[PDB]
Amino acid sequence: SAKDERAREILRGFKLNWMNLRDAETGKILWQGTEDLSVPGVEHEARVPKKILKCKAVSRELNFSSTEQMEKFRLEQKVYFKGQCLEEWFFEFGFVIPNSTNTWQSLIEAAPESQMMPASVLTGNVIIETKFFDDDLLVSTSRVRLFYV
Template identity: 70%
Template sequence: MLDRKRICHGYDILENSLYNDGACLLINSAHVPKSILKCRTVSREINFTSAEKIDKFRLEQRVFLKENIIEEWFFEFGFVIPESTNTWQTLIEAAPESQMLPPSLLSGNVVVETLFYDDDLLVSTSKVRLYYD
């Protein structure tokens, strides 16, 4: 269902194919430059296609550090036209630098779980383990 995720770092766009189509039971991995942790804001773009109409497309995203949820977001996209390709962009503001954890602690210990819904019907799940290089 979802093609790619883009992480904007300054003027550079780092592309990672993080999401598989269909239900994902495995944890994928992504290597991200540790310099992204110094950015004040990060722009995330998700491009997706849907063969069928989706009335209330939304996602829930949880970021785990080991077994603990450290961040949680809820996004609503709304109506998706059948046989369409769509782009969804969000800006995420970083915590103050004094509250940021070091890359050495985060790398390999962070898993981003994203649940994709049509209203309350779970459509797909993705899990990505992040490594900061």
């Protein structure tokens, strides 16, 4: 398919360079991944400090490079807990210049305290499924298992 070949071109040219999760109230980086978590067909793992569950909001800063242009780069992320979808997150970056490196910052706000899930319940049981799109074209689907430490 024309569309499959293009998706593959974009992916071959795409990578996540680094990513921070920063406490938006203190400024402190709590977690910094340097692995390319866009890579599909393998389960990635991430260990995050459990005190991230106490933040009122987190700044997620993602640095990525793309050889190909994208008209409307966006993400859909699902949070699966023991295979149940609990949450769905949507983020839009927009136009990506060909051969560019870009930092994308987004604020993820905590739910009310009474709805937050405990670390000991979550750890090892959460999968984040990320679909990377250019508008309606699915470029990659990646999976990351989270451990809260």
